[PDB]
Amino acid sequence: MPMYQVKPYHGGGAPLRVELP
Amino acid sequence: MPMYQVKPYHGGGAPLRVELP
Amino acid sequence: SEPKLSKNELKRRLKAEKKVAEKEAKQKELESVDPNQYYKIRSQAIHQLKVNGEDPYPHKFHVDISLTDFIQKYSHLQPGDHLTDITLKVAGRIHAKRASGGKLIFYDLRGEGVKLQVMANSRNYKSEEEFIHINNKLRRGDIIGVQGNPGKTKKGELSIIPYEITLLSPCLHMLPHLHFGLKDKETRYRQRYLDLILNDFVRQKFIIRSKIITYIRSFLDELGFLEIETPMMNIIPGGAVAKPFITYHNELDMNLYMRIAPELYHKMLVVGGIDRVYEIGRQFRNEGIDLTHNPEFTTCEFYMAYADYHDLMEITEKMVSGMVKHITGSYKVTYHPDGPEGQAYDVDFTPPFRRINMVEELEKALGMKLPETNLFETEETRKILDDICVAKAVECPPPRTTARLLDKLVGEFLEVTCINPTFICDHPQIMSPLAKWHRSKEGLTERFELFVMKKEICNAYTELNDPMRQRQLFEEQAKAKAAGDDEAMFIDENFCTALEYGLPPTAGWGMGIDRVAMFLTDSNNIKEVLLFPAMKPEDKK
Amino acid sequence: VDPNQYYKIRSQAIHQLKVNGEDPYPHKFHVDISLTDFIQKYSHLQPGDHLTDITLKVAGRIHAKRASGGKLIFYDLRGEGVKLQVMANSRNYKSEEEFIHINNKLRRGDIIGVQGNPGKTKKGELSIIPYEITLLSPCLHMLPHLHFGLKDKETRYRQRYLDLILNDFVRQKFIIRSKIITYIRSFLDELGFLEIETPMMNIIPGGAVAKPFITYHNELDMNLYMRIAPELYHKMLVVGGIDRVYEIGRQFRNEGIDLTHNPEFTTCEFYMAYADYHDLMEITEKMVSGMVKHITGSYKVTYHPDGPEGQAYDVDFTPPFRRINMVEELEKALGMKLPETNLFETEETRKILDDICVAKAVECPPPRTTARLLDKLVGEFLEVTCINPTFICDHPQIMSPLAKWHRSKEGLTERFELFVMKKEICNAYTELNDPMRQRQLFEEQAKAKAAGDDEAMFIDENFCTALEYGLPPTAGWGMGIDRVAMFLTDSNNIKEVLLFPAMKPED
RNA sequence: GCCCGGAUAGCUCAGUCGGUAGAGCAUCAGACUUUUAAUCUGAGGGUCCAGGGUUCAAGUCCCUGUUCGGGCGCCA
Ligand SMILES: Nc1ncnc2c1ncn2[C@@H]1O[C@H](COP(=O)(O)O)[C@@H](O)[C@H]1O
Ligand SMILES: Nc1ncnc2c1ncn2[C@@H]1O[C@H](COP(=O)(O)O)[C@@H](O)[C@H]1O
Ligand SMILES: N[C@@H](CCCC[NH3+])C(=O)O
Ligand SMILES: N[C@@H](CCCC[NH3+])C(=O)O
Ligand SMILES: [Mg+2]
Ligand SMILES: [Mg+2]
Ligand code: NA
Ligand code: NA
């Protein structure tokens, strides 16, 4: 029953390291 | 000049390590 | 004007006359604005500040540290301490002004949900005359910026001893005292800013709602769901029973209909080749307003290809249990449906929810044997259902169709027992279109509804991917809705074409954000989680 | 052949399948692995091996049905943007009569599930040799020709599902748009902001200069205007006490529909307390440059304003963005000196601007007010040289009725606009917290609305009353997230970055 | 749509059997250099939701609205 795994589009493990000014 | 630091409301330490199906 | 005016007007006039006569006969028996007109006095003081160079609206104030960080950093000071070598700049709104002397005043800067004292002593101020000037300017409710050193009073109260206080934004209205606060529902809903200023739980409620929405997005994205933005208006009214919000477009010289549900566009996207999609957004239904219904409301809807409602029944369990544990810190919550003085219910959100089949549980409760699942469409079932509804003292307004009678019976019997989150599955096909038929039991569909505290929060079913049956149901809907005219505008002919092009076996799910917010904030009114509920304007003169 | 004949024949065939107990719409097919994972995990196979010990189930849409005899048929499965080959052979298939039966009912465009063993052909192509193929959902319409895929813009925009099926770059465009929105949300969340939701139906429209949509509420006999900007509610929330707020939402405009404007569009508006436009000017630099670097992979992008056959413009998104002043640069471009900024709300300045517009052949339909003339002059002279991102700041207060007055220069406001590829993407200013000046500005707008200039902002008593309760020094910022997607996805059309763009009805 | 209620000072609330609406807070003026809901002294205020009526007199009674809290519906 666990659905097949698709990989997250918006990267993962915090891919975007937003540069807080 | 950078604005004073405000802690993120949504944990801020990657708390959303969701347990997925 | 009006001859002899009205007895009222006449009456009103005399009292006045009597009022002014008594007033003059009293005060003179022995211009200053009356003290209750705080707005006029404050406005004139601010204007006088403007004209003589002391503009009370500075463009920029440089804040060094937030109040929460100040409290966290300097809570370790002993009473009587004064860190003369540390200078910090904070800002906030004045909530109290205790004048213990001509040269010692105490302010209560409230901001970010916390409070910080400000003990202004002219001895520590830069000079006496500017101390007097600034403390004469300041009033309660004014946004001010304080530069000073951390310290702790002899009592043991953390405070900032100011070297210079600047007025950032004066308040021109009376600010209610926090001991009484704001408790009028109409006043709280009309002026939400005052509600946030005076009440602290409102800010926590909205933080909780934001946390709810963030969690869902994160979970779905990790699963691999893509976020989409579907149109909010359409040129087609659609076949839904819910009344839409009509609108006019002058350039197209036509009417545009507000979105009721994004289901069709999501299914078209799944046809396109995007297996998993989701969208959190507003839906507009021109219907009634009560404690759990709003005409415009936020919902999260996702579609997952190569899935059925059985997989969704586990995904929903994981979503809800994880969200409740993440936000409230545990699995059990307390809900007050009637208010803080009514009965409190303990709602347990352990992972494995309860699952009940509608027909069997209804037979167990109603007490008798309803017909077989294939015979619901017969008028005999409608008749026996009407007999049961009448006998069991259940009231259903006309029309007394099988679907409406069954829904009334379900609400009366199967729904007073749904305190803990519960799945109600396998609806009859009549009560629900757009759901694939049940693969095993004839006459039933493949949907489920999640009910928490006797209220529906989730709704999911296997999507019907058969173009012929979907077209038949759409045409039946359009026939019922049109009552003449032409069904041309009550049938989506692009969704049908997409279905003919081919839709994989899909499962669709949809949750009401507002209702979840009310359940996780102990609010019995949907307006408590809406920032600005719609309030008709109060006629004024 | 005739698409109508193909549709009729396929409908008849599928009906025959239904009546024969061979249901072409199964309720569930358990997919074990995704196509992308299948490609990634078994790409190490040698050209010709056959892993008979592994049996996986995949699903997807058939894109090509090539025949190589009665015992070998190749299928081209397409899933998440990748390609897989299914070499159906009679030997490996569960049964011969069943191989023939399944090969006579499957055609291109059908959604099928394949259970089989991974392997590779002699030509070195990864494939899944099937043990059993299941038809999940037939395609009753004839898909467009392989060499003549969807190229008509109108057809692509009206039928987005066909565009997704045939064209692969559309999925990448929408993935990039989702990435943009997610990056903005993550940036603002980590900064300390709180996401909010403001009403989409307002008794009085306000917050921007636009023509609103009018709807009728049923429970409330009063009519309701659709949202044009959430500004007046964000400021009320900041008055309430929440210092940093933001909202990514849909705004509605009752203007014309073209290749750059849509009735409903997505914008992001954040509001900071104890800030000014000089701080937002740094935050915008940081976030825009970071988003470009995180999505494109570099700071330099290439944009084609008139299609791939036109000129290519290299836009650099180095964090520091160029900064210019409206009045000074407009004077330099015009080769003259405009009247003093403290005399901009008068009539002789309007006459001078009208004469300059006439001399410079700048076109401006009536009413020819000072604000509109200045906007036309700036668009014709200032924004046509802002290829790289650039800040145009210090606007006159006639062009901004909600921005705070400049500290040192009279008649100007504390605002800036971000212009990239000669188009505005951002708009930010220090909020006006003075109730009296705000009331005066609102009053002036009403004067105009009264006589022409219907676009003039409406009057709101509730916002002024809230301002009377004390609004801290705040700064507001708003970005239109449709143009950012157009520039990042290299599309000179809003309809390209919209899932279902509004289109003129066809006869 | 129908039904049952509410509306009194900026905020939180009294007001009898119709006889001049009044408490705390807030606001205004003045004291008091360690107070936290500071305290102490003195002062003013409301078309009692708005309109009409009955009455010698209406917050108080009758009748219209207005705006709201609920309950039915409506959202298949
Ligand atoms: N009028 C409404 N106001 C608020 N929430 C609603 C409303 N109607 C439905 N919902 C919620 O939204 C979810 C999905 O909407 P629906 O597609 O109507 O089932 C439901 O399960 C409800 O929790
Ligand atoms: N009709 C429209 N369609 C799409 N975007 C629009 C439309 N009108 C304004 N915008 C966006 O809003 C900004 C310009 O208007 P404004 O929001 O008032 O500054 C730009 O970011 C535009 O992309
Ligand atoms: N609007 C739908 C969305 C979830 C089911 C998807 N077909 C509902 O809540 O019933
Ligand atoms: N709401 C404005 C931008 C906000 C700027 C700061 N209040 C607009 O759409 O043009
Ligand atoms: Mg009433
Ligand atoms: Mg005093
Ligand atoms: Na009151
Ligand atoms: Na009194």
Author numbering:
A (entry chain E), B (entry chain D): 1 to 21
C (entry chain A): 14 to 43, 69 to 579
D (entry chain B): 71 to 577
Manuscript text:
Amino acids (aa) required for protein synthesis are delivered to the ribosome by aminoacylated or “charged” tRNAs, activated forms of tRNAs wherein the 3′-end is conjugated with a cognate aa by specialized enzymes called aminoacyl-tRNA synthetases (AARS). In contrast to its bacterial counterpart, h-LysRS has a 70 aa N-terminal domain (NTD) that facilitates tRNA binding, but the structural basis of its role in aminoacylation remains unresolved. Herein, using a series of high-resolution cryo-electron microscopy (cryo-EM) structures, we provide the mechanistic basis for recognition and aminoacylation of fully modified cellular tRNALys3 by human lysyl-tRNA synthetase (h-LysRS).
A final reconstruction of dimeric LysRS bound to a single-modified tRNALys3 and two copies of AIMP2–N36 was resolved to 2.75 Å and used for model building. The RNA modifications on S34 (mcm5s2U) form specific interactions with the LysRS ABD, wherein R161 forms a salt bridge with the 5-mcm moiety and the 2-thiol modification stacks against T191 and the aliphatic sidechain of K193. In the complex structure reported here, residues 14–43 of the NTD are clearly resolved in the cryo-EM reconstruction and form an extended α-helix that is anchored at the base of the tRNALys3 T-loop and runs along the anticodon arm of tRNALys3.
